[PDB]
Structures are given as structure tokens and as C-alpha cells.
Amino acid sequence: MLNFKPYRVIMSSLTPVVISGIAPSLDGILYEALSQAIPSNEPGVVLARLKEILLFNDELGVFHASSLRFGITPEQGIGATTSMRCDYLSPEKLSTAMFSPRTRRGLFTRVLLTGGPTKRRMTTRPAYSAPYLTFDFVGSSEAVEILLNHAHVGVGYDYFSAANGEFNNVTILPLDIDTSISNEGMALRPVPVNSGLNGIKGVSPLIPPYFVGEKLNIVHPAPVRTQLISSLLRG
Amino acid sequence: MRTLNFNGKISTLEPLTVTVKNAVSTSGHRLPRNGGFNAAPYFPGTSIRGTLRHAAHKVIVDRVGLNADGKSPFDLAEHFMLAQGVDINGEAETFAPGEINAGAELRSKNPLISLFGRWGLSGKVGIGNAIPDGDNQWGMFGGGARSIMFQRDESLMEFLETDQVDRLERLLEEQAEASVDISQIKTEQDALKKAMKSADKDTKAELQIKVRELDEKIQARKDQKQESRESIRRPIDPYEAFITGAELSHRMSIKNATDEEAGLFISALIRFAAEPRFGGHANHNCGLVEAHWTVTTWKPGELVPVTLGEIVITPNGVEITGDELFAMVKAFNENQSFDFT
DNA sequence: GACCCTTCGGGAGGTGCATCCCGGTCTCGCTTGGCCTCC
DNA sequence: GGAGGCCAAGATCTCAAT
């Protein structure tokens, strides 16, 4: 509840972005930032505060916060990369100063690393590398600036652990038309299927956190969309 | 219950390097990049997170101590729970997926699992990448070339007996012969590769077949060698690393940090400073860093940062500034309820 | 212890000669049975 | 004598390069 104007936020991508099937939405990032600012994890409290900085569309039940859209320059375009996470079992970890291994004949039973419950996990995920990341929203520019600059939030999946989707140089520039939910009849964010918007069909919650709550039949845009950075700055 | 944001810099006293599978091509070794070869590299936050998790694990091991017999009181299962976060025996608590604020008791008893999570319990510690500030702060370090210790220093030949000198001569001759033969095989393989693109779709198979067979001929040729399977004299490939004195921006956070969990984190950073190195190639003393973090929090009820203090890690010592940080460390040190088993 | 009067110019190079060589790695991210000793 | 533990075996092949 405030004077909310439509803004476009452009951030410089520093790390490849991992997309969990559905493109990350800006309201998700702001929800995480507010869950860190408000020392509370209750969805009710965070949503109650999030509505003070993001416009909430009662009719659709979704925040005026667009999904991720990669901004490509002529110098660099959308690329394909993998997010590599591994177990590094150093000689310190495999030492008797840390744990007491089971002993047979006095020898220490070695950790079976090729497989089993104790295997080196070579977990790899697809990631996308583009020069810029762009979101559209309607809300307080000051609060969103502060949250994006100071909170521990990234764009994508598991920024807390892997630091995927690290960004900096958050630029917010005002828009003329609200392009946060719809644009020429195509949904720009997960919206209810009955909204009449076109897009890829899927099952997901409508408000953050998107891993919690009943999953309704939604319509969302393509997970990987690219726009030229020159055309994004036009506003 | 508050969020502690660590914003600061990491200065490399020595070159800083890391080997990642998808960034190391066959053409050479490269740092992780968010794009092509012209993009600026970064030091992964996963490596920093692993180093700091190991430091916290060492803090816990030191705190708990050793049993009367001198053996560590952690078995393999508890060791992997603290270190990697996996549960190998299936004895871990499986919280219901619906709730978020789960494991409150476990988070209260085991600060390390609360900071750095386990499978099924999200961790409160977020550790970001180390993004460089400049534009030419990375270079191809390492390199060098392995030599033969007896062709460089002639005084070493006086130590060898006649049979050993003969063995060395045989080794050198075999190395030269194998080098020439393998060079010929590689030449033929490359000739196949150049015409591979011009080859027809049907021919796309048997050309790869001959390349494969050439590869095992190289392997068999190296197997035929007797004195040594590998050529002692060889160029060492350089590794890419951040230059000495590179300034890297680092961001770290603890989400909903109790005084005990934040105290464990500060203690881990204190213990990390004894050997403050990230990455690998430690044989060239790579990875050694110095960092200063400005610990800050959020003002309750509004979106205004509040500075609580500052942590500075230098080769000359660790400087913790701010009464709040000392309160966190003391709270961790005084707690008598933790059970990491 | 009062003050003149401060120069002209000549003339600037040429040569050789530019090397040879090595020698380019090994792992690994899975599960299961066969078999060796052990408690 | 399971019971711990090790070791060898199992299909075919992966193009991106300042």
C-alpha cells in the first residue's frame, strides 16, 4: 500500500544461473530478501510485508513481478554452462584426528568413494550464462534497490549454497507500461490458467515461497527468454 | 534471531586458483567464467563454502576433544553428517516437506548443521563468490618444465654406480625413441582430424575408429617402455590464477543467526586465519589470502543496515572489532548443551 | 668612482651478422560378486 | 561361517576452443 510505479530492474550477471524448470520471478527474490531482513520465516509475515513494496494483484493472486529474462549484448549472448558441485574428501577429512574409523587387523577400513552411501557426489546441473538479467515489477524502487543490493539473494536456484546467479550493478529504471504480468496477451509470469493468458502450462504455486503450498495449474512463460540489452534500456 | 551480512574484500597474497571440471578444457586450464574466454573469471563460492565448512568442522572437533583412549568420539556416520551433510546409515530425521521452520531442536543442538545444512535441512550460511574488482587481475601462472636431475647437475653422476649410470642411459634412449614414435602417431592422428571435417557422413565412423586405434597404439607403445612408462622431461602446463595482490569482492550471510551459530561462524573464521588459503596448487603456496569483512545486520522493523563490527584477517593476526561479535563468540564458547553426535 | 661592448663556421660517416632442442602425464565420482582372512 | 573388507569386471564412446 503505497505509490507504486512500474519499474524495470537490470542487473549484471556474474555467475551462471540455474533455472528450476520455471524461470525465477522477482517476487521470489524479494521474498527471500525480506525473509532475511525480517528475522522471520513465516510466509504470512513476509508476504504481509512484501505487499508493502510490491503491488499485489488480487484478481489473479500474483505479485506484479515478472519472471527472469536474460539480456544479451552483441558482445555476449545466452550460453550453456553446467553448475558443478563435488565432494572434496581431503586427507584432513580422511584422518583419524577427525573420526575413529572401524579397524580390521589394525588397518583402518577405507571409505568406499566410487559408490555407495559415501561416494564422491559429482552433481552437475544445467546453467545459463548471459551478460544481464532483467525483471519487471511495480513497487517501491527504494526498497527493492536496498533489498537487491544488501540482502543475500541471487537469481536462480540455490544461491545460498552454490552462489549461482550472483549479480551486481543493480540498475532500476522507470517504465511507461506495466509489463510485469501480461504483454500482448502472453503471460510474463506464473499466472492462473483461467486468466486467459498464453504460455507454457505447468503446476506451481502463485505466491512465494514457490516450494511451499498447493500447486495449482498455472500458465508461465518460457523459462529461457532473451532480449537485447539495447531494447531493454529503451523503457 | 537476526541476519548477519558479511560484506568485504579478499586480497590474494599469492595467486589464487581452482580447478573446475567444466572450465578446464583440453586446450588449457582456465578459471570459471560466466561466458566466453573474454568474460571476467570468478572464484567459486562453493570452494569458499567448502573451506569454511571444513574450518567449522575442525572447530567442532577441537571443542569436543578426544575420548579417554585418545580416539575421536565421532564415527564415520557422524563424520559425514558434519563434513558432507549426507546420512549414510539412514538414521537422520526426515522432516515433513510442508513446513519450513523444521529441525528447531536439531538446529539448537548442532550449530554446525544449522549453519551449513544437511540433506533435508537448509543451512543458514550463505557464502558468495569472490568477484574480482579490476580487469587484468588474472594470469597464467605455474608453468615450468620438469627436467632430468642428472643432465642438469653433473655432480650427481658421481654418486651413481656403473649399473645405475647404464640404467639412466637406457632410460634416456627409451624416452627419446618413444617420443619420436608417439610424435609420428600423433602426426597421423592429426592428419586424420584435419580431413575429418571434409569426410563424408558414412566416413564419419571409420575415421573415428582409426583415431581410437591410434590412441591405443600410443598406449601400447608407452606400455612397451621398460625403464620408465612416462617421459621424465616434459613441459608443465600452466594454470590460470588470480594475480598476487588481487582484490576480490566477497559477500557472506547468516540467515536467522542465533548468538551461538554466529559465534561458531566467527570461530571458524578465526581458525580459518591460521591457514587462510583457498583453492589448490598449494605446492606453489597458491591460495593464501587476507580478507576483511564488515559484519552488518538489518535494523529491526525497517530496511536500514546496521553495522555491528568488522573482522580483519591479516598475516599478522585477526582483529575482531565490535562488542556484538565478541558477545557471539562468548555465547558459543559458554554453551554447554551442544551434541554433535 | 662615472662608461663602452659581447663575433663569425665548418662538418657529421661507413659493416657485419641474427643459432641449435627437448618433451607434453596419471583419477574420478557405480554396483556386485569372488575370494581372503577375521572374530 | 557369516562377516567384513578388498579387487576386477561389466556396453561403447563424448567436439567447444584466443
Q: A230: burial class by Cβ within 10 Å (0-12, 13-18, 19+)?
A: exposed
**What is the resolution of the experimental data for this entry, in Å?**
3.1
CB contact under 8 A, B89 and A84: no
Query: What would the grid cell of residue B311 be?
Result: 573482522
Q: Whole-angstrom distance between the N-terminal and C-terminal Cα of chain A?
A: 25
Burial readout B164-173 (b: 16 or more C-beta within 10 A, e: otherwise) = eeeebeebbe
DSSP state of B43: B
- SS3 for A62? strand
Look up residue A87 and give its amino acid: D
Helix (H) or strand (E) holding B257: strand B247-257
Q: What is the dihedral of CA A10, A12, A15, A21, to 10 degrees?
A: 20
CB contact under 8 A, B256 and A41: yes
Look up residue A189 and give its amino acid: R
3-state secondary structure A110-143: CCCCCCCCCCCCCEEEEEEECCEEEEEEEECHHH
Query: What would the grid cell of residue B145 be?
Result: 618444465
**Residue closest to sugar C1' of C26 by CA:** B230
Residue of A nearest to B80 (CA): A118
Asked if residues B222 and B182 have their Cβ atoms less than 8 Å apart, the reply is: yes
DSSP state of B87: -
Nucleotide nearest to B235 (CA to C1'): C24
Sign of CA dihedral B72, B78, B79, B82: negative
Q: How was this structure determined?
A: cryo-EM
Alpha carbon distance A27, A148 (integer Å): 11
- SS3 for B297? strand
Does any CB of chain A come closer than 8 Å to the CB of residue B129?
A: yes
Query: What would the grid cell of residue A50 be?
Result: 512484501
B56: left (phi over 0), alpha (psi -120 to 50) or beta: alpha
Residue of A nearest to B118 (CA): A161
Q: Which of A2, A11, A13, A15 is the best mutation test for B, with the most CBs of B within 10 A?
A: A15
Alpha carbon distance A32, A15 (integer Å): 19
Query: What would the grid cell of residue B248 be?
Result: 576480490
Residue of B nearest to A13 (CA): B34
CA of B218 to C1' of C10 (A): 78
Residue of A nearest to B69 (CA): A100
| Pairing relationship of beta strands B310-314 and B317-321 according to DSSP bridges | antiparallel
DSSP state of B288: B
- SS3 for B233? coil
Sign of CA dihedral B261, B266, B271, B275: positive
Query: Which residue in this structure is represented by grid cell 598406449?
Result: B219
Distance from CA of B28 to the nearest CA of A (A): 17
Q: Cis omega (within 30 of 0) on the bond before A208?
A: no
CA of B177 to C1' of C17 (A): 36
CA of B42 to C1' of C17 (A): 49
Give the A:B interface size as CB pairs under 8 Å: 149
> Of residues 115 to 174 in chain A, which lie within 7 A of strand C by their beta carbon?
115-116, 119-122
Distance from CA of A55 to the nearest CA of B (A): 18
Query: Which residue in this structure is represented by grid cell 553448475?
Result: A83
Candidates B128, B298, B303; nearest CB to A163: B128
Alpha carbon distance B71, B65 (integer Å): 9
- SS3 for B269? helix
HSE of A24 in the Cβ direction (CA atoms, 13 Å)? 24
CB contact under 8 A, B3 and A39: yes
Q: Report chain B residues whose CB lies below 8 A from the CB of A160.
A: 122-123, 125-126, 255
B234: left (phi over 0), alpha (psi -120 to 50) or beta: beta
HSE of A39 in the Cβ direction (CA atoms, 13 Å)? 15
